[PDB]
RNA sequence: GUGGCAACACUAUAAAUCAAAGCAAUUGGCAGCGAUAGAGAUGCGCGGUGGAAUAUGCUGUUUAAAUCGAAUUUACGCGCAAAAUCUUACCACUUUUU
């Protein structure tokens, strides 16, 4: 849980830092009411073992594995700053821990 | 040798061997020695087994092989959370390399 709590939790400064206004110079900022953190539980399933090498049907033990879980929701206008924002997953690298990302967004259709 | 009516009562050494025979406080194992605590620990209940058939494992018998270990509790739905060939080590036959 430590490893993807250090990820959300630099994943979120990133975010912040991409649709950061710097400087007030220029003034279509979204913090719509759409964006969230949601945490999530997890997918429960006990996978056991015969203790002993040999004859030992009475020697059991369980076993298990864990996948811990956070969606990060964010959306934007320009694609410059969703570029930084894909070059940036792609140079800071993460112990242990996936990425899965989903890209909904407009695109013209002939 | 003294006493007696005696059973024997004395007095009384040794020969010969052994390397310990012993003793007291313990520390542990026993209890067919009690007091206090705890366990469906029972007598308190329910449902089984052992009756029938099937599944399944084991011995024993035979077969060419029925591969091999697990053996009283704790082995017997055990290695096998899976054998139609392959898994598979066993046999029949035909070949292969040292």
Request: with cysteine; glycine share 4%; proline share 5%.
């Amino acid at each position: 849980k430590r490893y993807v709590d250090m990820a959300c939790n630099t994943l979120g400064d990133i975010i912040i830092l991409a649709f950061a206004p710097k400087s007030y110079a220029a003034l279509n900022l979204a913090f719509g009411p759409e964006r969230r953190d949601v945490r999530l539980p997890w997918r429960r399933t006990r996978i056991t073992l015969i203790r002993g090498p040999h004859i030992d049907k009475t020697g059991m033990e369980q076993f298990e594995r864990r996948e811990y879980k956070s969606v990060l929701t964010a959306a934007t206008n320009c694609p410059q700053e969703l570029a930084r924002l894909l070059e940036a997953v792609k140079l800071y690298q993460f112990t242990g821990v996936q990425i899965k990302m989903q890209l909904a967004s407009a695109q013209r259709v002939d």
